[PDB]
Design a protein around this ligand. Structure first.
Ligand code: UDP
Ligand code: UDP
Lengths: 473, 473
């Protein structure tokens, strides 16, 4: 039985994919897993989440080892982007990770490292341990990241200022609009960190991705066979998705109990992930749009911010004492007493999304969220905010046909309550709504097939374990 | 009942479309047809093809009259392109065609002339007979040909040296790379012959094309309604395609018998049309790529040439006595004894492509070939060589999504056996392969709809017969 160590980047958005991957391997592929989870400075949430997961392993086939964050406040400023921040954190923690692996009683045979932990190459190489990246999102975004080194040299000026879509060899073309956050401003350090990340991928022995063949056959084939791309990559790709939490059934969840009282596929779940937050004006538009729709809803709400759309990613612990009602339109909660259920800070998305009464998901198009929705056969309103979400949203709406979206990107134009209402009703009242759901259910099934024995993703994991064992010479 | 005469240009590429058109009109539109087929000096292929078609007409509603080629060796030289050659041939045969039509017991009411026979205007006009061109290819190429008169005056220097794509009003933009052969070298006489051809179209009473509305709705609309284009065209367009041979089921075809022994959609058919030939180096790369793919194949091979990619166009009868094995890598045939079947010179392409075991087509993107594939629901590897094929290949790969292709044009960069293998496996092993096939089958159905009663193409033929009868005042 192999020992594999998986390094998790800071934040729940990265920690969860890693935990899920480790669980997947331990359960379905009979592997010992050690998750090296890079912690954030301010979340007893993340830490106690880890304590609850360590408590559940009687079988110790999975073990969790936290990596304490190094203080980088002296390295950053008010304009430093989360991309850059995570990269820096990882880099500054590399010595600690070295000492950890060195101090391990029994070494890992392999090391799989989250998207931001690509800077840990030297440690794996030094110890002579098989090294892979986990890209817990789309192959499209991976292809963009890799080929970005080429774009950097072939394109002058900002990508956002281009007239023609970016053509990644063998992939679907990307409009300036839908680019990932690093490519928005090339003058920003996160951009160069990103081009660098794109290159760093290729230095690993392989790349796991949380997608599958059915979902992205063309992009995956491009990574494997497109000659321009392969000139850059030259290492195996492992579509192993869609990996997500299996639903833990809680009898004491009042949200679930409200949902039990609802009709099948009658509820819209509304959430922008752990990181997402809306502006005051947009959150107001949203409150009223939901009201106007007269559809039933469950809405995870956070205090609004008119700054960065992911500014709640590291700052969810910042104790804003204000009640929900204070940053909602007055009496909204009084008027939607029957119609909806407003949830503070976080909820068990998965358990919610698996509930029969849920029939719609207004999402930021975070890949974890997306996967969770699709695997439960839920159609979506695409509301991209940060990271790669615009790109995923383009994929979801245009190509896959499992989501609808505003005429202009939410991050570009205010989505008014009239449009919000209209979208919500399309999803929840109309036949367009039905057919979106059917497609999402088809994707649900294709995903179930990929993960089930002999599926592309099951097999891709077997190929991975092969790759690892062939390297243990 | 109308009498229509259809003039065919030299070579199988042109003769077949004309035969098919005549058959289509005679059968489905109850018309008397007389096909005036301009012959090549050396093809028992062309002649026996004619014998097979003459044998089928007990009803003589279609009759075939050969036009013997005139000797033009004194008019050409070693640098004279096939474009120019065909134009000259036609021109020099014009008197003979005149005497033929003049000597006809009962005149044709109309005259439809192949792409290269646009120089027969004077004969039709003189006799006062309705005159049309048949453009047995894409509307995109037609639009380019017509608008080329404008490009000539608006662009200085070579098209191949332009930075921006050529924009034909109302159509998809064309990269320098994908231009038709005449536009490659403007200093060449074939270029001016081509600009001239583009203009000549517009002097006819109408233009038939072997495409349909579903396939090229926007280009067709542009021809009809774009003001810039209409300033040049001002005559009706008739999308009547996709017209091709109906499959004649042949007793002692050994290729068909090999195919019978194969699995469904397990065979790659490989062919570069009547004209196409590969360089020695490329044909070697190809042999090995097919070998490496470990996919089953049927491959129509011709002796290689490092010169003109269509240099087998007028030499298709010339029995080069060299065995296949002499211009293939040694023992290739010995090693692929089980895996493939290498065919010399010609093959019932239509009957092969309709065979259940055929699941892939590596093609030069000749429009007849393309149509044959699409109408049988076969996905393609786009390998453009000559004429307009690059442009068709762009259309097939980028827009339609029914073909895959090399990173760089085959005629630009050597396609190595690694890439060949990869492409072949994408098509024949992967899910990308599956979905390309489904799209090709959707096109198959849309085509079936166009041709069936009341379809755009059926109707376009009815519109044509209307046009002819309104001109018989
Ligand atoms: O109320 C919430 C908000 C978020 N999440 C989870 O937290 C992550 C969202 O974080 P992020 O904004 O990075 O989006 P992602 O790309 O992870 O979906 C996903 O795993 C969601 O399942 C959740 O379970 N409940
Ligand atoms: O081995 C071969 C090669 C070509 N063809 C036929 O010859 C015609 C030539 O059309 P193509 O698309 O190849 O155009 P070209 O490039 O020859 O002008 C088509 O009907 C093909 O089916 C055939 O029957 N067998």
């Amino acid at each position: 039985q192999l020992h594999v160590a998986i390094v998790s980047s800071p934040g729940m958005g990265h920690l969860i994919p890693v935990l899920v991957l480790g669980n997947r391997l331990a359960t379905h592929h009979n592997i010992k897993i050690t998750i090296l989870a890079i912690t954030t400075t301010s979340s007893s949430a993340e830490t106690e989440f880890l304590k609850k997961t360590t408590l559940t392993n009687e079988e110790k086939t999975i073990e969790i080892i936290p990596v304490p964050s190094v203080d980088i406040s002296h390295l950053i400023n008010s304009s430093t982007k989360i991309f850059t921040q995570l990269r820096l954190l990882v880099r500054e923690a590399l010595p600690k990770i070295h000492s950890t692996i060195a101090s391990m009683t029994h070494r890992p045979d392999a090391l799989i490292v989250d998207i931001f932990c690509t800077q840990i190459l030297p440690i794996a190489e030094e110890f002579n341990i098989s090294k892979y990246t986990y890209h817990p999102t789309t192959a499209w975004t991976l292809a963009l990241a890799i080929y970005c080194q080429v774009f950097d040299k072939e394109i002058e000026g900002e990508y956002v200022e281009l007239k023609e879509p970016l053509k990644i060899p063998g992939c679907k073309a990307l409009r300036p609009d839908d680019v990932v956050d690093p490519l928005l401003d090339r003058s920003d350090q996160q951009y160069e960190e990103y081009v660098k990340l794109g290159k760093e991928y290729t230095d690993f022995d392989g790349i796991l991705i949380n997608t599958w063949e059915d979902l992205e056959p063309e992009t995956i084939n491009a990574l494997r066979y497109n000659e321009k791309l392969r000139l850059l990559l030259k290492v195996p790709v492992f579509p192993i998705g869609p990996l997500r939490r299996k639903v833990e059934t809680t009898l004491n969840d009042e949200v679930i109990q409200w949902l039990d009282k609802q009709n099948n596929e009658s509820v819209l779940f509304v959430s922008f992930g752990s990181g997402g937050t809306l502006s005051t004006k947009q959150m107001t538009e949203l409150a009223w749009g939901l009201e106007l729709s007269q559809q039933k809803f469950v809405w995870v709400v956070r205090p609004p911010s008119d700054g960065d759309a992911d500014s709640a990613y590291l700052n969810s612990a910042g104790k804003d004492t204000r009640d929900m009602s204070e940053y909602l339109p007055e009496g909204f909660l009084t008027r939607t007493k029957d119609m909806g259920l407003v949830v503070p800070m976080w909820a068990n998305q998965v358990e919610i999304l698996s509930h029969s009464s849920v029939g719609g998901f207004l999402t930021h198009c975070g890949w974890n969220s997306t996967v969770e929705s699709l695997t439960n056969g839920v159609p979506m309103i695409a509301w991209p905010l940060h990271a790669e979400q615009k790109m995923n949203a383009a994929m979801l709406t245009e190509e896959l046909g499992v989501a609808i979206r505003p005429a202009v990107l939410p991050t570009k134009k205010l989505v008014k309550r009239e449009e919000i209402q209209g979208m919500v009703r399309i999803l929840m009242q109309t036949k367009e709504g039905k057919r979106i759901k059917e497609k999402a259910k088809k994707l649900k099934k294709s995903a179930e097939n990929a993960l089930s024995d002999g599926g592309s993703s099951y097999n891709s994991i077997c190929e991975l374990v092969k790759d690892i064992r062939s390297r243990e010479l």
